[PDB]
Amino acid sequence: HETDEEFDARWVTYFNKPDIDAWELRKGMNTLVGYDLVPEPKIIDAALRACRRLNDFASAVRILEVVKDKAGPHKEIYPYVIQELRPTLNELGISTPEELGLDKV
Amino acid sequence: ASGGGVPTDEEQATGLEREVMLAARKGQDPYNILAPKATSGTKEDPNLVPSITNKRIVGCICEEDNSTVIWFWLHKGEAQRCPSCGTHYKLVPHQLAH
Amino acid sequence: MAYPMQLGFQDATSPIMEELLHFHDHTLMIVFLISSLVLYIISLMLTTKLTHTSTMDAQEVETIWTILPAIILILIALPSLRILYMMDEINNPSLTVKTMGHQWYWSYEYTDYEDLSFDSYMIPTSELKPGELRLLEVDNRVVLPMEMTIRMLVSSEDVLHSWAVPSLGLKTDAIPGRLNQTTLMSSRPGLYYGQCSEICGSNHSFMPIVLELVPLKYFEKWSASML
Amino acid sequence: MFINRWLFSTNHKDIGTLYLLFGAWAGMVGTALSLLIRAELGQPGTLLGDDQIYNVVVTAHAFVMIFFMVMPIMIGGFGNWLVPLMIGAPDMAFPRMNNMSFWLLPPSFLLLLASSMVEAGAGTGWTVYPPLAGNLAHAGASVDLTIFSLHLAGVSSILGAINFITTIINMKPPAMSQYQTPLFVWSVMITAVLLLLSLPVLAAGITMLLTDRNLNTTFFDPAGGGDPILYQHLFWFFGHPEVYILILPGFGMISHIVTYYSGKKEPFGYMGMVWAMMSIGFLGFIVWAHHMFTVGMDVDTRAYFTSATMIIAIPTGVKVFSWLATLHGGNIKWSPAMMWALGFIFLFTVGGLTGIVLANSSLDIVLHDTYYVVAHFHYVLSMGAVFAIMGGFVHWFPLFSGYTLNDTWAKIHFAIMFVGVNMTFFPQHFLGLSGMPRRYSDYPDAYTMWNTISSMGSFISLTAVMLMVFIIWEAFASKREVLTVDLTTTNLEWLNGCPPPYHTFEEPTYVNLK
Amino acid sequence: GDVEKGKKIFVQKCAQCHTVEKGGKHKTGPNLHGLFGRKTGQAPGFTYTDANKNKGITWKEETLMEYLENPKKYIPGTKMIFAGIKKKTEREDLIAYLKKATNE
Amino acid sequence: APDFHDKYGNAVLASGATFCVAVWVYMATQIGIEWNPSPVGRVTPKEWR
Amino acid sequence: KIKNYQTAPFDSRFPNQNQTRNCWQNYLDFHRCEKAMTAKGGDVSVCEWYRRVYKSLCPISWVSTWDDRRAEGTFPGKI
Amino acid sequence: FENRVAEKQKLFQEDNGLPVHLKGGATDNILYRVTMTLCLGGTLYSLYCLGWASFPHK
Amino acid sequence: STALAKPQMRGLLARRLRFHIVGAFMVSLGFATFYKFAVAEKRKKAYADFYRNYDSMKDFEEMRKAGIFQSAK
Amino acid sequence: HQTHAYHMVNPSPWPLTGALSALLMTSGLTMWFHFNSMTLLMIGLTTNMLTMYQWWRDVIRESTFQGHHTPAVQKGLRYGMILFIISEVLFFTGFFWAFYHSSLAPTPELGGCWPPTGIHPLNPLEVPLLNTSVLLASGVSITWAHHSLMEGDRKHMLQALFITITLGVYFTLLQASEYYEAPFTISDGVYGSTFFVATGFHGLHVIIGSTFLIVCFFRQLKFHFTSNHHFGFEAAAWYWHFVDVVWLFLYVSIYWWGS
Amino acid sequence: HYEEGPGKNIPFSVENKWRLLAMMTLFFGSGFAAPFFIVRHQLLKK
Amino acid sequence: ASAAKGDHGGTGARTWRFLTFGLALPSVALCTLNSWLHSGHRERPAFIPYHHLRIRTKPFSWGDGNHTFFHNPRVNPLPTGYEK
Amino acid sequence: ITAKPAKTPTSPKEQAIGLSVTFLSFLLPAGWVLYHLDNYKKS
Amino acid sequence: SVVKSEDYALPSYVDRRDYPLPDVAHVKNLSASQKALKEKEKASWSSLSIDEKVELYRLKFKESFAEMNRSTNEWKTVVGAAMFFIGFTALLLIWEKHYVYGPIPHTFEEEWVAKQTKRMLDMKVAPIQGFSAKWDYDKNEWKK
């Protein structure tokens, strides 16, 4: 077994690969949401930057949805993650699901 | 205490039994009687999956002794990857019509 | 006998039937513990949006759920087997009474001293006296002394029957060619009913057992009058 | 064309469809028989006649539900449809023998319906014990027709067992070990081994009954030195494995349903599930005399049978906890099939626990041959086996047919059935504790209230069964063709589309050894 | 013997296959009005075995005493299915009841 | 767009429960079913001998 | 002489629920005893205990069947 | 005896679309027809015997 | 305007299960005594109090006077 | 065109005819037992033979003539025959159970002894000893036939198989004769019951096994078997061995120990 | 060869939903009716 | 055991033939002689109408209903004794 | 599971027809026999 | 799309919480302005309007998380319909009482029950807990 830190570092490295392809982006995210955790902001940051290298705006918004979804009834987790991602969201021009009205049922 | 009169498979085997027999002698397995051995499964060294048609179902036992098999259609053309472990598979022509 | 809307066992009339009530209370408490634990755990599994869908390791939690059930099973088996052996122990009866199943009635033989025997047939509904019980009364009751250990021997002269009296904790199959033994001891005087408990054809539902438990001195007079 | 396809089949899918149709029709027959029973009991007094015609109905109810409904649907229907598809086999090992296992059942059922039409019927109980079933107390052809019906169903299932075992051992892809086959495959294989070993013994025992009835043998007749209790040994040596046979394929289906609708790729604790089913199949051979605790056996024998019977709770608990551990962390989809499977888990548990109460020979003296046993076995058969069948049917009906069910209707169907079966059998515990015997057409007055309530329950289950017919009709009437199915990576049976073509796996799957 | 004792024995053991009154229809077995002083197998329009037809004894107290003890011993081939009544005294009472009842 | 449940769900629930209750109360009480309830606290015992 | 007889005592040779053989053994013991006594000109009343035990335990129809069979020469047990 | 299996292999592999139970020639057809008539006639006779045995007429 | 604190983000399902599984036990054991104290213990006491001074002869004399027996008027 | 090695069987009528013959035989035993008539029964035995003939004929066409029995198909048939024999063993086990139950606890109706009063058992050292030596010798001669066949020797395979069949026939006539001479019958209580039903079912299985050997003998005369591929012959030898072992258990249990 | 696909892999036609209704009705309705008619057959016997 | 035997340096048919003719058939010939000596008609038992034998609870479905299928008049009495 | 639109949609009224017919096929024949019980019961 | 009949073998679209990035894009065939928008997507996302962003999201995915997770009113239909069918069952139970069942036995008449209850009490049926235990023999009434 590895530390939390080592798990997070491996995932950050995974998404930071410069030439990550779309298959790998999908596989990484669909794998990661199978775990009992909400991913650290530094992992989501690396995955959003991969979406940018892949010219895939829609998947960036979807990744933010799935973070909110992984937190279940712990409603304090997603506002904290968004806060921490703000500088990246601004740099990359990523609108949150809320800013797009995609949180309305 | 002995003489002959009993035909051999070589003389008398026919149909698919004979095709399996002749192919076994040449080290060939057109009717999928043996398990193929995996390659390293990389993009450069994909598992080669013979098919007589344009797609075939692959089962991937991603780690040895997994009881769960991951199944998917492999299509003709560029190598595809197991959705669980990422190992690469590529469809190749049957030969199989022999 | 059973009474309307009854939930559990007929009141015990013998110390062994008392033992069985407490043992059933002990077992049913366990059944309720396990069934409610399962229902609670199911609810728990189904009431959260949190997920974990990746592979889960099965070698730790599996010990508990193998070993805790084993322990529970011994906790049931120990008092269950105590009672089984209690019911089998040597007793020394003061009387032996035989019953033979027939299609569809019981005969009784009391042959320790005299050749006493008679038949015992269900009272048809149209002949019940006022206040008597439908399907349960008979013309000739099985009169027996109370507070005495009695050896009951059970057989059949035709098909299988089964001689039962729930109050006393008794049920002994009646098998032609075979002589099965059970022991009966009532703590109280009274009337105690049972019903044929092996499918025996057309009138299986209609060949009940009625014991009449009375002091030895009354049993004697009644026996003499039955000769 | 029609005759070649449907009477001369050598195809596992069409033969499985035949079994499903046969089992569905038999289920209607079983249901009608169950309503006639509960109508007779639904008020005090005699409705039909005496115990002869009443027990002809009770005996047929049981043979029909067991031999013509549950086994054909689970093993012939889901087994044939699913087992080859789940191991990527092109068909069963013996595709023409498979067709004979099917075609033996209509004639077996005809013999059963002949037994009830001639003389006064075989009012014997489904255990068929002599001397009641012998030639003096049941003179004439009924019981011999019943024996023959069991011989054909027996042959059908023995040859089906040989076919499934040989198919599951010999026809996997060559890299796939037995520890890579799905739990439903395991469950059918283990059921097959139980059939293979237990039905010939039943066959020997009912042949001895036939020869006692017609050739003047005396296996079971004390006058010639025979023993009625020898018949019960032979019967129950089959008859306990028989109840595991009725549930094991249900356990397999439940592991698939619970896994699928939890959004998991696999059941929790796969090797524990295989171990538990093998442990249950083995232990199910050494416990039969718990059906004979009042016959007059020695005390040490009763102590052994008590203890050996309870042990089966341990591997069964491992399966129930492993299903809960499968739900744990799932993305729960509340489909009708999942609702069947959740009801199965709780209700089978309740029925298995009252079986453990019955395992104690001391208490069983007072519960044997009373409604408490009837409550026990309907919780594990009319809820357990039946719920797993309905869950499997709703789950796989779009694979077999190519069409989807209306899920709202199917949920409505589950709710009605849930209420009916519980209203029917729950009160039967009170009736058994308080002494009401089995196989009675009438009861002392005190037992009225629970009999009344239980019969009302049976009518609610009838309404469910009628509704089920309508739901299948609506599906075929509307023709919503399946577009996408999820989780095909871990559910190979779906990967050839809905319905799959007549021939599948003409080119086998490719699986590396690695 | 005792007539009403014999009435009870007849109700419990025979009434289901026999009727006693002048009139009363044949059931599994023949009607019994006029039984005594008379030959066997003679009740109008009942199908006897040849054993019962051709038995050649006259029913009276004496011959009914032997027959009721063991019917198929006395009439081998009989179709009457009834084991028999062991007690002399119960046979006496059943006969005294049948003596009265089968004749008004 | 509202679905079938949106449009009719309240009415199916209200009417179904009303119907179910009325017909079961009616069947249980109005047509002579013998429930054989307990005599305890209800029956006055009477001389039978 | 040892009356006071309430019923047949517990017999450790037959300690189980099936008592068929207890009835049979006592029945044979009574008849063997009595034949041997008559043969050897002796008593017969020494056989009484066995008669009391079989009479207590044995169904009346068994006894009476076995009695008919001894008088017939078809009793299968050795006496 | 002479080994004539090659001739039979040729006959049973001939590409005429006949199922194996008819592939031997006209004799297969006759036997098949005899078997199917006895099974079907027999099953009808068994149904007749059922209806007969189902009522009493004595 | 003040940052949000970093919350717990890992093993949320496991934390939930560890909290509630205690309660599952307590409710099911929980019922614990209920059957035990409300049903079993009440039963033991009912039989002990019934028989503590029970008089089988007076019980029989009451039944005999009520006319219930065939053997005893 | 398939790229697996398994056999897709042509649609066939024999399963339905086999099923129907089972209806006719069973309803035929019913009519024979209760309605004094042998007609249904003889139709069913007729259709049952016709069905077996054409079914196994077709298996021969598929394998010898068409080449469908690849090693994977042949292995499946191995399993099928082993499982079928296992089910026949459990069938006999029921009769042995019946035999031991009755003989270990003889009832009073029997005289409380085994063999029952009035029963004079056969002498296990007379014809039963001979039957034993006949089936054992036939296990030796069938093994000779097997080795001759693997070594390619037509003539000695046929001589050895011929001897094996002759011994099975000899056993069958010895047994028929012992049945006629036996002073007890099937109606002689539970001794006659267990004795004739257990040895009678065994007799039937010897007739079946001998017929299978006769089929192998005729297929061998026609050169069907190669020195490496002859599964019909091995299935008939396994069945023959099963038949020999059941006799050994009968001979030890019923003739020797139960005499 | 045989027809393949939804509604073609079954021994009954689903071409017309009302014909289908009639067939299903006779199918399931005959199995459900049969035990009532047999009980009646037995009662009519005596 | 081994018996007294020997072989595994060669070819099987020849050995199994040696066993067939040198051991198996000689054994059958000895038991055949042994039977064709220690046989001859055992005298017929002597009739006792025992109730556990000659059971008739239903007539057999052949003959007059009272004869067993391999009935032998010399040694198989009917329920009423030996016949003809 | 997703599906294509119904090829031959079955409207509320057609469902009511299918439901009704199905219930009647079960209830009428049984209802007929159970209604006439006492007629047969005349031995 | 002339993808229809070999289609079951092709990768496909699913909306599921636990599979956020499906194997294919929801929209298969793009219009000209959607193709223009895919090309614009290769430049800075800050230059995209909100409407453009929602459009790119809808080319890729069919429903948002909030849509695919919404709760529904289905349980009302299912519970109310189950109650309707269970209420219909009571109609059948009425018809059966009216036309199948005859007379209940005479032993359920009020007078029989009053006398049978006394006789049960006189024999002390279940005098420990079950029945006569509930009778006060001193005051000659049911216990309160």
Ligand code: HEA
């Ligand atoms: C599906 C069919 C089925 C199944 C699976 C079972 C399973 C079991 N049954 Fe049952 N049974 C029948 C169907 C079946 N039964 C039928 C038809 C009859 C009557 C036959 C006739 O007379 O007609 C019958 C009769 C029968 C009898 C005879 C009673 C009598 O006639 O007097 C007994 C007695 O021991 C018995 C016991 C058991 C037990 C111990 C199990 C066990 O397998 C149950 C094990 C399961 C559990 C215990 C629940 C899950 C476990 C856990 C959650 C772990 C924790 C539990 C504990 C620590 C206790 N059954």
Ligand SMILES: CCCCC/C=C\C/C=C/C/C=C\C/C=C\CCCC(=O)O[C@H](COC(=O)CCCCCCCCCCCCCCCCC)COP(=O)(O)OCCN
């Ligand atoms: C020569 C040795 C070879 C044995 C074959 C001989 C011919 C008869 C048929 C054999 C079938 C096998 C066993 C059936 C049971 C009974 C026959 C037992 C063997 C036998 O042939 O017993 C004879 C009596 O046979 C009788 O009743 C004969 C009555 C025949 C009635 C057949 C009953 C059919 C039984 C149904 C079988 C069902 C099979 C179940 C299938 C398994 C399902 C999975 C013995 O003759 P006996 O005069 O009584 O005594 C000799 C005194 N001199």
Ligand SMILES: CCCCCCCCCCO[C@@H]1O[C@H](CO)[C@@H](O[C@H]2O[C@H](CO)[C@@H](O)[C@H](O)[C@H]2O)[C@H](O)[C@H]1O
């Ligand atoms: C155990 C499960 C079965 C539950 C069945 C309960 C459902 C009842 C459905 C209706 O059945 C019908 O009822 C009618 C009466 O209501 C019957 O007509 C009968 O009664 C009519 C009026 O009294 C007469 O007009 C008819 O001629 C006479 O047959 C009719 O035959 C019968 O089909």
Ligand code: CUA
């Ligand atoms: Cu006697 Cu049931």
Ligand SMILES: [O-][O-]
């Ligand atoms: O059977 O349990």
Ligand SMILES: [Cu+2]
């Ligand atoms: Cu069991």
Ligand SMILES: [Mg+2]
């Ligand atoms: Mg019983």
Ligand code: NA
């Ligand atoms: Na009733």
Ligand code: NA
């Ligand atoms: Na070989």
Ligand SMILES: [Zn+2]
């Ligand atoms: Zn993989």
